[PDB]
Amino acid sequence: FLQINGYAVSRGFKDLELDTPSIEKRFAYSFLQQLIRYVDEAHQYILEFDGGSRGKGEHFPYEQEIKFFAKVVLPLIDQYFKNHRLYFLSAASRPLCSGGHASNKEKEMVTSLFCKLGVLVRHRISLFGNDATSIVNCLHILGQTLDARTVMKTGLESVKSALRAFLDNAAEDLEKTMENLKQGQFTKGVTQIINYTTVALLPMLSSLFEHIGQHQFGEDLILEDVQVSCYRILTSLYALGTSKSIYVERQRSALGECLAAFAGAFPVAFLETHLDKHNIYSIYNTKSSRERAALSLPTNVEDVCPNIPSLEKLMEEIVELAESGIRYTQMPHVMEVILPMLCSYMSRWWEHGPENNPERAEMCCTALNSEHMNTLLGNILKIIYNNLGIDEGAWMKRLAVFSQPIINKVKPQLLKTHFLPLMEKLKKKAATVVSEE
Structure with missing residues (x-):
């Protein structure tokens, strides 16, 4: 109303x-x-x-x-x-x-x-x-x-x-x-x-590194004295996996996961030191020599990380140990940590390789190629072939999920003539009961 x-x-x-x-x-x-x-x-x-x-x-x-x-x-x-x-x-x-x-x-x-x-x-x-x-x-x-x-x-x-x-x-x-x-x-x-x-x-730290990795972003996070701490962390968690000790044996897997995540998270070539001078985005290049003299920095990349060997050398000992086919319990260092080291390294720097970017010639830092990954994954599969009926375990199980991005990266057309090695190493061991990949 x-x-x-x-x-x-x-x-x-x-x-x-x-x-x-x-x-x-x-x-x-x-x-x-x-x-x-x-x-x-x-x-x-x-x-x-x-x-x-x-x-x-x-x-x-x-x-x-x-x-x-x-x-x-x-x-x-x-x-x-x-x-x-x-x-x-x-x-x-x-x-x-x-x-x-x-x-x-x-x-x-x-x-x-x-x-x-x-x-x-x-x-x-x-x-x-x-x-x-x-x-x-x-x-x-x-x-x-x-x-x-x-x-x-x-x-x-x-x-x-x-x-x-x-x-x-x-x-x-x-x-x-x-x-x-x-x-x-x-x-x-x-x-x-x-x-x-x-x-x-x-x-x-491993969770943080995985976060950084699957954001692919954090090349800004890496900064001054952050590279100093990063090289300390790299050399450190690498020496932990390199040395053998009754204490470290129990936690081998954890440190392997952690340093595998660290390799992916860290955006500067940590293993490619021979031609890293070509890089310009490397904050170790950006700080300048004045900052190298001011800060506790050895002024030479080779003295900064001398413990870690060169990439081509490491991969050739990987090749020769795969050819020898030594058992995993004999010396588990490489099969437990080093293979994930490479897998994370190539997985992170594949798009950065000159094969994906033929541009900026002689400004390319890391050198990698499809045949490099193919040879290294062939090494991984021949190693697991050598260690199929030997000592089993779950290390191959975890390195398989670490190598999953590599098998997505590699072309299935290229992994023809490798299909057969995939079904074999699995079909032939009918006597065994463990299943993997």
């Missing part, structure tokens, strides 16, 4: 303002703000329990807070990130074009939480009541949801320093780990530190 009489009733007060310009508009941003807060309280808590752990009293007044953190903050991060993984991976390509662009502030504070969770998990697995594996999975999903390139190209200097230190601390931890295994060959705090290293430190 009011309407028909003509009086028009509406809302008492129309909108006065709108909160879209604010970056705390996103409940994700606000929740992550509160989250970083509670984790800062957790950090000062863990400093307090580290002070009291050296003290006699192991009783903690903040046990309720410890349980709250571990049972709420730790799993909620994981579930949120595995549910809205695409939201953080918004890389200006507009994924899910309807919406879901994570802000640069969102990503940078996610990276700060990333780093501070790393700092917390550093050497506290004993304090974690068997939930240390849960923190390991948590930082796995953190690394899978990482978006660090945007925040490093545009971000706050504190976030920059945090993201550097996140891998720096792992760098000196692993380094002193290698000095301690070989100095203390004889059979405690150092044992607990090595347990932390093997259980978490290698897998977290």
Whole structure:
């Protein structure tokens, strides 16, 4: 009756303002703000329990807070990130074009939480009541949801320093780990530190390297002193797989996976040092000789990494050991780590090879070709042929999934006359029961 009489009733007060310009508009941003807060309280808590752990009293007044953190903050991060993984991976390509662009502030504070969770998990697995594996999975999903390139190209200097230190601390931890295994060959705090290293430190870095690899982007992440830490990491996790020891035998597979991921993630030719002078994007080329004299850098690529041999030499010992057909239990070094090393190397640098880019002649860094991969995969298949009925295991099982990108890369038309070696090595061993590939 009011309407028909003509009086028009509406809302008492129309909108006065709108909160879209604010970056705390996103409940994700606000929740992550509160989250970083509670984790800062957790950090000062863990400093307090580290002070009291050296003290006699192991009783903690903040046990309720410890349980709250571990049972709420730790799993909620994981579930949120595995549910809205695409939201953080918004890389200006507009994924899910309807919406879901994570802000640069969102990503940078996610990276700060990333780093501070790393700092917390550093050497506290004993304090974690068997939930240390849960923190390991948590930082796995953190690394899978990482978006660090945007925040490093545009971000706050504190976030920059945090993201550097996140891998720096792992760098000196692993380094002193290698000095301690070989100095203390004889059979405690150092044992607990090595347990932390093997259980978490290698897998977290491997997850980060896999993230970098399947984004294919991070040639910007690699920066000054980042190459220094990267060569330290390379030589280190390579010497771990090169040396044989009763301690390292158990964790051989983990370090192999980790360094295989590292080879793919690292975007500068780490094995092609003979013609790396042709590269210009190599940050070791970009820093200039002034920065080489200023920083602790040996000024010569050959002295920087002398332990690792040349690519053609390594592949020719691979060829000759394949021809010899030595058993895997005899010397498992190469079959366990070196073959994934190559597989990741070629898989990453195949599109960078001059065969895919006949342009920029004599500006090509890494030299590789289809026949190179064909010979090396022939070596792999002849090795597995030699070790079919010998000692079996799962190392061939995992190197098969590592070599999957190579068999996708190689043309099936080229892998004619190789179809038969594929069905054979499998059809002939009817007496055996193990199945692979």
